[PDB]
A paper describes a structure:
In addition, a dense coat of host-derived, immunologically “self” N-linked glycans shield the underlying protein from host antibody responses (Wei et al., 2003).
The secondary binding sites make contact with the D2- and D3-arms of the oligomannose-type glycans at positions N332 and N339. As expected, the N295A and N392A deletions resulted in a substantial decrease in antibody binding. The [name] transmitted/founder virus naturally lacks the conserved N332 glycan site, thus this glycan was also included (T332N) in the [name] [name].664 trimers to introduce the “supersite” epitope (Sanders et al., 2013). However, the [name] sequence also lacks glycans at the 241 and 289 positions, despite their presence in 97% and 72% of [name]-1 isolates, respectively.
Numbering used by the authors:
A (entry chain I), B (entry chain G), C (entry chain B): 523 to 547, 567 to 661
D (entry chain E), E (entry chain F), F (entry chain A): 35 to 58, 65 to 141, 150 to 185, 189 to 309, 312 to 321, 321A, 322 to 397, 412 to 501
Write the structure that this text describes.
Amino acid sequence: LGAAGSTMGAASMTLTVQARNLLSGKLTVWGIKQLQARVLAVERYLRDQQLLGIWGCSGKLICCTNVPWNSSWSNRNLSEIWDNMTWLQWDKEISNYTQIIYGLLEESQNQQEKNEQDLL
Amino acid sequence: LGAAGSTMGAASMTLTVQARNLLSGKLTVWGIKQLQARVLAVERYLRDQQLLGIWGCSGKLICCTNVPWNSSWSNRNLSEIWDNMTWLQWDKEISNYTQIIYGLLEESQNQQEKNEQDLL
Amino acid sequence: LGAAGSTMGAASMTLTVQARNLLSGKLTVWGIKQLQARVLAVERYLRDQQLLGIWGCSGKLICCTNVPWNSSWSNRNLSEIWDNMTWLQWDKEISNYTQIIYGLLEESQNQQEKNEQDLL
Amino acid sequence: WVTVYYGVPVWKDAETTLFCASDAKHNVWATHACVPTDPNPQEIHLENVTEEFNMWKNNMVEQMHTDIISLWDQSLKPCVKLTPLCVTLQCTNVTNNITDDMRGELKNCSFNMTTELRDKKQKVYSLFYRLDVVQINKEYRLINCNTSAITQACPKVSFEPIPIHYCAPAGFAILKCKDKKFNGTGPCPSVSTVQCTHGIKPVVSTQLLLNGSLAEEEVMIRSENITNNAKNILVQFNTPVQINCTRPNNNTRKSIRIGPGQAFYATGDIIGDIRQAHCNVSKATWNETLGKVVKQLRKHFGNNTIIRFANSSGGDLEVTTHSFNCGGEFFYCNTSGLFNSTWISDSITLPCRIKQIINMWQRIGQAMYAPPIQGVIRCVSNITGLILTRDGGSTNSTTETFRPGGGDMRDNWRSELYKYKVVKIEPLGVAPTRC
Amino acid sequence: WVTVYYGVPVWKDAETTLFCASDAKHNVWATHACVPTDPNPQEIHLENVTEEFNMWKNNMVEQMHTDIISLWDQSLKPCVKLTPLCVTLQCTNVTNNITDDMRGELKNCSFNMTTELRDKKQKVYSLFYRLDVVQINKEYRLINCNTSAITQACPKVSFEPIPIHYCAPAGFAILKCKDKKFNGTGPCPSVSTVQCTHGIKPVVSTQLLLNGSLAEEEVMIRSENITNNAKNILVQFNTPVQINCTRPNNNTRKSIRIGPGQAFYATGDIIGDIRQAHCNVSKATWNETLGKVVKQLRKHFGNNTIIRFANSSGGDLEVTTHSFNCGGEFFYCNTSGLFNSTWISDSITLPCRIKQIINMWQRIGQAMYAPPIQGVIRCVSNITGLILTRDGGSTNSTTETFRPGGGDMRDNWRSELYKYKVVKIEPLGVAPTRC
Amino acid sequence: WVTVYYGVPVWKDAETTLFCASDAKHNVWATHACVPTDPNPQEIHLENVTEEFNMWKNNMVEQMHTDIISLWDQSLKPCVKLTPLCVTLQCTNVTNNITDDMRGELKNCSFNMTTELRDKKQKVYSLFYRLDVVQINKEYRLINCNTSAITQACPKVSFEPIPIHYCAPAGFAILKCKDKKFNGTGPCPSVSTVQCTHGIKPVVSTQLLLNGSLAEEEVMIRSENITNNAKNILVQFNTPVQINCTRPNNNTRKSIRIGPGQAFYATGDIIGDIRQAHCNVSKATWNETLGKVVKQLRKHFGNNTIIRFANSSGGDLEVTTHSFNCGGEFFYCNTSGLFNSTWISDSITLPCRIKQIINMWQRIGQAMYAPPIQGVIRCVSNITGLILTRDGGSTNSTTETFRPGGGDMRDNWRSELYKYKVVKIEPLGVAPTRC
Ligand SMILES: *[C@@H]1O[C@H](CO)[C@@H](O[C@@H]2O[C@H](CO)[C@@H](O[C@@H]3O[C@H](CO[C@H]4O[C@H](CO)[C@@H](O)[C@H](O)[C@@H]4O)[C@@H](O)[C@H](O[C@H]4O[C@H](CO)[C@@H](O)[C@H](O)[C@@H]4O[C@H]4O[C@H](CO)[C@@H](O)[C@H](O)[C@@H]4O[C@H]4O[C@H](CO)[C@@H](O)[C@H](O)[C@@H]4O)[C@@H]3O)[C@H](O)[C@H]2NC(C)=O)[C@H](O)[C@H]1NC(C)=O
Ligand SMILES: *[C@@H]1O[C@H](CO)[C@@H](O[C@@H]2O[C@H](CO)[C@@H](O[C@@H]3O[C@H](CO[C@H]4O[C@H](CO)[C@@H](O)[C@H](O)[C@@H]4O)[C@@H](O)[C@H](O[C@H]4O[C@H](CO)[C@@H](O)[C@H](O)[C@@H]4O[C@H]4O[C@H](CO)[C@@H](O)[C@H](O)[C@@H]4O)[C@@H]3O)[C@H](O)[C@H]2NC(C)=O)[C@H](O)[C@H]1NC(C)=O
Ligand SMILES: *[C@@H]1O[C@H](CO)[C@@H](O[C@@H]2O[C@H](CO)[C@@H](O[C@@H]3O[C@H](CO[C@H]4O[C@H](CO)[C@@H](O)[C@H](O)[C@@H]4O)[C@@H](O)[C@H](O[C@H]4O[C@H](CO)[C@@H](O)[C@H](O)[C@@H]4O[C@H]4O[C@H](CO)[C@@H](O)[C@H](O)[C@@H]4O)[C@@H]3O)[C@H](O)[C@H]2NC(C)=O)[C@H](O)[C@H]1NC(C)=O
Ligand SMILES: *[C@@H]1O[C@H](CO)[C@@H](O[C@@H]2O[C@H](CO)[C@@H](O[C@@H]3O[C@H](CO[C@H]4O[C@H](CO)[C@@H](O)[C@H](O)[C@@H]4O)[C@@H](O)[C@H](O[C@H]4O[C@H](CO)[C@@H](O)[C@H](O)[C@@H]4O[C@H]4O[C@H](CO)[C@@H](O)[C@H](O)[C@@H]4O)[C@@H]3O)[C@H](O)[C@H]2NC(C)=O)[C@H](O)[C@H]1NC(C)=O
Ligand SMILES: *[C@@H]1O[C@H](CO)[C@@H](O)[C@H](O)[C@H]1NC(C)=O
Ligand SMILES: *[C@@H]1O[C@H](CO)[C@@H](O)[C@H](O)[C@H]1NC(C)=O
Ligand SMILES: *[C@@H]1O[C@H](CO)[C@@H](O)[C@H](O)[C@H]1NC(C)=O
Ligand SMILES: *[C@@H]1O[C@H](CO)[C@@H](O)[C@H](O)[C@H]1NC(C)=O
Ligand SMILES: *[C@@H]1O[C@H](CO)[C@@H](O)[C@H](O)[C@H]1NC(C)=O
Ligand SMILES: *[C@@H]1O[C@H](CO)[C@@H](O)[C@H](O)[C@H]1NC(C)=O
């Protein structure tokens, strides 16, 4: 985490670095913890990879979908949002729509890209 | 599992939902089970993801390859197979060719897409 | 491992076979080992999959990037290197540049493919 | 041409490890360690889907049994050993106020016990139930002393059954049979998918099934083979029968230090007078219910048959009596007052015995000592079913007799898990197309 | 339009399992099992980032406590039981060369002990400290014999604290507060990210905090609620105070076989004369330091107040004395010589007691017996802080009195972990754009 | 340009955890827990591949040793303790029918043993072998009673070696050396890859290696340093030698209850007469085989040398005798009848001793008591190799003497695992191209 307090725009050209350490890769006291620590890192990693799989990106870090931005979703200028404020600040307001956005990210893209390219 | 007894054709526009819950994401009685339960879910998930990796799809749910359909593989009309019968029913007959089909899915695509695009 | 002592050129048309068995997929003596054996296979598998994710390939086995080959990196003819010598032999000399190459594989591709396609 | 699909609804019979979930104190089933349940465990009905079940080949039963026994032993492990009680005992009868039947049932007995300082003994006494001692030729020894170590259950651990839900790991699912006449085997059209079963309380009993689920409409008769006298018949009622059990003696307990932080809970003196610790079964409800059981049994034997009931013919207390547990106390009630009469075409009281040294799960080794409870015990349970066996002999004419057989706790589980099977999901398959 | 980004610097408060790391013999904290530390644990300063901390709600403390107690019990598990020592003891005074104060402190005491062949006893004797025995009406028993089993620590296991680093699992991180005046709670502008904390030695003590970290500039006063007399005040010094402790008696030990590979280490005869086993605190440094403590306490009470010190008012030795451990020996020192005088506007010596039967972590059950050490013990420690409590009563005018209270080892941890919090990284989020 | 390939055949020396596999009762090696083996464990020959091996630095040996010792202790954990047998014993000689040599070998001995009721003792007797008792000044104690607790092996657990296969976790592989003259170290051109080793029976012995694999063509001589007298020389035969061992005494056993489910198996009376329990080695085969061993030893010393054999010079029974196990019985045979004569240019019988209290793995603590076997024991084994040491002194001229040294079970493993090494696969690499 080096992007820190830089703005979301600025914070984009460093996603690689943070991504790199997300996975990293008897019994008795400590041995138990080390085992579950390894299991947890794996479970969390995959928990998110499948989501980018479903929100058809896969070749991640940065990707775009076919969902329009809603005006209720903190409709503020791009000149502020993707230039003069940080992720953390953004997450604090946008997170209210997390499930809504995620449902749209999954289905709007899969309903229109899949099926259509199977016909074609 | 909501596609249930719908036909394979119908069952296509819901693959997202089933896929979503495939991964989901001390010691003593129960604690042991919970640990292996988590390990197993991960192992099964990856066991299949690598296969779609090899049968060059990755950006899964639905994908196509360069393998022709064999006439021995339940050659029945598409108007029945992908319209008026269920997966379960299909699996009961097509599964006899599982290894044959899988070997073809891996190599016919990798032999012709890879190498050819390395030359190009 | 069947490519064995075949040359790197020859060893290419078999990457599928080796890749297939990389993942494969109480307590007391033996039970402990079996559990960590499963955990380890998973951790190693993912440890590498994320790297091919970052070195934007994903649809792996064979892929190309936008990094030029350096003359310090065993500059020997392709007619030897990718025709008349084995991986093992190659790794013994090229490995001296592992971190250098890897850093370039990650960033040269992500800096130029991402951002550029976000503008476009 | 050949195309592949991933999230396809295809499953196969499978066996995996299922885990506990609970609604989230410190009882014997440690159901704190189970992780809280799903507030919205919505089933997915599978439209136009058939399925096949067999309760008599269902491995979910084996896991429930395995988990309970293992858990039982775990919970009793870090507790006081009673090895020092295996000494010659000097016993007499408790005769202060015998209420006729409890004549030889309670014994007043003394012994030389180990103290904190292992060079001096103390003379102590406690009360024992007749079933817990053996006379050695008025000298006695504890029953099972010659067979196994006796361990005192930790006094703070509750034995009240708490519903346990079994849940599948991701990639697996549990299918639930919704055919409300399902006899335990064969096809069950109309099935739903759940990630977790409903909660099942780990209630243990013999002869009469307590606090279980009820049949939806009719009393159900289920057996692996109804004509095989070696198999049990499980009967699931479609209505509860109330049973009220008590142990009226007002008890006291003594704490006797044996060693350095090691103490035994002795049954102390009894306050007031003595009672049989009987159970009440509503009379009309019980026999009316049996009339329903008979109506259904006839379907497999003939509508002109005679159904007779009789009591258990013999064997260990766990198979001759109604074994159950209330508050941690162990009861063995006489059910000969229930399994009687014949069908051709007010309150029942059951005397009971109390026993403190219990060999659970019908094992030879390992005995548990139930510490005394001082408060007067009262418990009300729902009889939800029966374990019956068909008798043998010539089984001639049209007359058959059923008895309250029992033993093997796996059947009690089986009676709740019969609606479920474990399957694995194989989210990958191919089909022909033109693309 | 809606686009998604992965490696975004977003984190939330979180609780996970942290694990041990060490710099990589066989001490009580088994820090061989911890995996070697990172030779280059470079922190990442987070530019333009604020954060909020609360040392009094920090779950890292609970894990450190849990791990230490569990680990302690693990290490002492495979050791010799001293149950056979709970016998009547015949004790007299050690009077060969009493140096005035050690008058009734050492007792010479004999007993009939179990031998390898369990049909013959041996007559043996050993020395005991007064605090380890109870007179029973000159017959004695070991203290806590009537309460718990006593286990001898394995003689080869070191009790020297080794720094332990806590590390986060991937997907998690630990944030470090760099505001060098942070009072333990609220916002801490200027935070850095680490995967691991610095090493913290698991030093256990009461009243005086030893061998911890120092405050960067000023003496820091920290409390959950400084006006709540039920809460402790932790004081972190910005300079060490030297404390020198000794146990001058030249000891010997005897090995008494009790059984088949089971042996007890008895305090043997003392060579030479007897001493109080006192501790020296540099006089000027100590009281100068208190002057600094007072200057800072005044900020919360008024600059016209009177700060007075007094000793602990009463309770168990762990809360009335300076409990600490040197070389495996357990000291209980009298700190009334330190907590004295009043602020308005050479060497101190503390007598101490030695005790071998220790109930650690203030539990009722489980006692550990510290085997004797023959070499003369000397240890030098850094006093790095205090545990103080504000007294009660009418607390009138401008005068307040503080005492060296203590107990509950979680506060010692808390004093080192206050700069850290655990967060989880959620590397996924969306933002608007036009693409 | 720079391109990357994944499934590349590149591996490095590596150390990981290997796991058990078996062909899938309840023996001491719990090989039910191992998961069934691969019906078709096809090796992959690596064409044009060289590799380097070192059997004397092979960590597979350390895991096999670690697993066996841990497993041994696990299997013997839940068993009857014999602590109560450490009492004064009153022993005499068994003189009913001594067959000359077995003069002082069997003792008839009585003692006062604990009973189910711990207030009364029983007078019992049993037979002991001379090697299991110590005379205390005809009073005796059990050997090792003064050193360690003695535990009775559970009577139902088999000690018959079952082949164990070691398997690599995915991402790892085991390479097998196919050079059929490999001397244990250095390059081994011609290597194949397997996921699992062949099965190795965990046979334990000293001096003579039993039931192992055979050399493909020649007798092989292997050592870390053949000129270092501190190192052992392992000899692998290219042909088996038959050895037939017996324990002819027809035994009985008594079961003596000690406590509440705790019982000891005592050697009971012997039916018929007494025998030495000797072993037969085919005479010609044995010495012919040594002639082959000599022919090969000469290659390292000179073709004009003298090779002499002598017996073990001294030490514990495990290094002076042929230690082995048949049916759970422990034999110590005298091999001085084998290691004899000199090479310049019918049946052998070995007397043996029987011992019941065994300290396995040459540890000081923990003794196991082998319960008696009633049936007459007969076993036939394959001698497959030798453990030899080169003697010292001036080692002058051309004459050298070898002795049947031994101890340290790791060498027996090493003798089977020498053909294998563990490597890790690193399926990722780059190479130049133009694309
Ligand atoms: C195991 O232990 C458990 C725990 O104790 C046992 O369960 C208990 O069983 C009891 C008996 O069945 C039961 O008691 C009944 O509760 C009913 C519920 O009433 C509730 O509402 C009223 C409203 O004010 C409250 O006051 C009351 O507290 C409750 O909240 C009552 O309605 C029942 O009363 C009837 O029976 C009693 C018996 O003595 C009569 O005295 C009473 O008058 C009622 O009977 C009249 O009505 C019936 C209706 O058909 C007529 O048939 C009957 O002849 C009576 O009618 C005549 O008389 C009345 C009055 O003179 C007159 O007006 C009318 O015109 C007629 O002349 C009764 O109180 C407990 O609640 C129950 N406890 C629990 C927790 O469930 C269990 O059974 C035990 N099991 C076994 C095997 O023993
Ligand atoms: C079939 O299903 C039924 C219905 O669920 C089930 O009946 C229930 O059985 C349990 C276990 O026997 C009963 O629980 C006990 O009830 C008594 C009665 O308390 C009443 O009054 C209090 C007043 O506040 C109410 O809160 C309560 O709801 C009742 O109205 C309690 O006293 C028991 O608690 C004590 O014992 C526990 C045992 O582990 C302790 O954990 C607990 O802390 C209490 O112990 C303390 O007090 C003791 C008094 O002597 C003392 O000795 C201890 O040392 C300690 O101080 C307990 O709650 C429950 O009430 C029954 N339900 C009903 C409706 O009656 C059947 O058992 C079940 N059948 C089968 C076969 O499983
Ligand atoms: C706050 O921080 C300080 C500074 O770190 C810390 O002080 C240190 O405490 C430890 C533990 O008490 C001290 O360690 C002991 O030191 C003695 C003295 O040895 C000196 O001379 C040798 C000569 O080569 C030097 O190497 C050494 O550095 C010293 O100069 C040692 O003798 C102790 O070792 C024995 O006891 C250990 C206990 O487990 C054994 O493991 C070890 O093998 C040794 O035992 C052997 O000898 C014994 C002699 O009688 C014998 O009885 C045993 O059976 C066995 O044979 C040990 O190293 C350390 O020196 C202190 N540091 C300083 C600078 O003095 C404070 O304790 C800490 N405060 C708190 C409260 O934690
Ligand atoms: C090198 O490799 C060789 C070859 O594999 C190996 O030899 C074998 O050693 C084992 C172990 O000593 C031998 O196994 C025993 O054989 C006896 C003889 O039984 C014969 O007759 C029966 C009749 O049906 C045949 O089935 C059988 O194959 C033989 O022909 C058996 O009696 C033994 O079984 C008893 O002891 C077991 C010990 O755990 C029990 O588990 C088992 O249940 C049996 O016990 C019961 O009977 C006992 C009789 O007194 C009674 O006391 C018990 O309480 C219980 O009731 C066992 O099978 C095997 O036969 C040998 N193989 C050959 C070809 O002879 C070498 O040992 C090996 N060398 C080394 C050093 O490892
Ligand atoms: C962007 O800034 C302009 C400046 O006047 C303002 O009018 C407009 O509404 C802003 N857009 C949003 C979404 O805030
Ligand atoms: C499809 O249906 C037509 C109808 O006549 C039939 O002739 C044809 O063979 C069918 N194809 C297959 C593959 O069954
Ligand atoms: C390739 O071979 C030619 C042959 O003369 C040589 O001149 C050239 O330098 C070689 N290239 C490399 C990179 O070795
Ligand atoms: C206690 O021991 C004495 C010893 O003589 C015996 O007389 C007495 O009966 C014993 N007491 C009991 C209750 O067994
Ligand atoms: C040992 O036992 C004897 C038995 O009479 C007793 O007199 C003696 O005092 C005991 N010794 C000790 C030290 O307790
Ligand atoms: C048993 O104890 C009595 C007590 O006097 C002793 O005489 C006898 O010899 C003991 N028996 C044995 C076999 O040790």
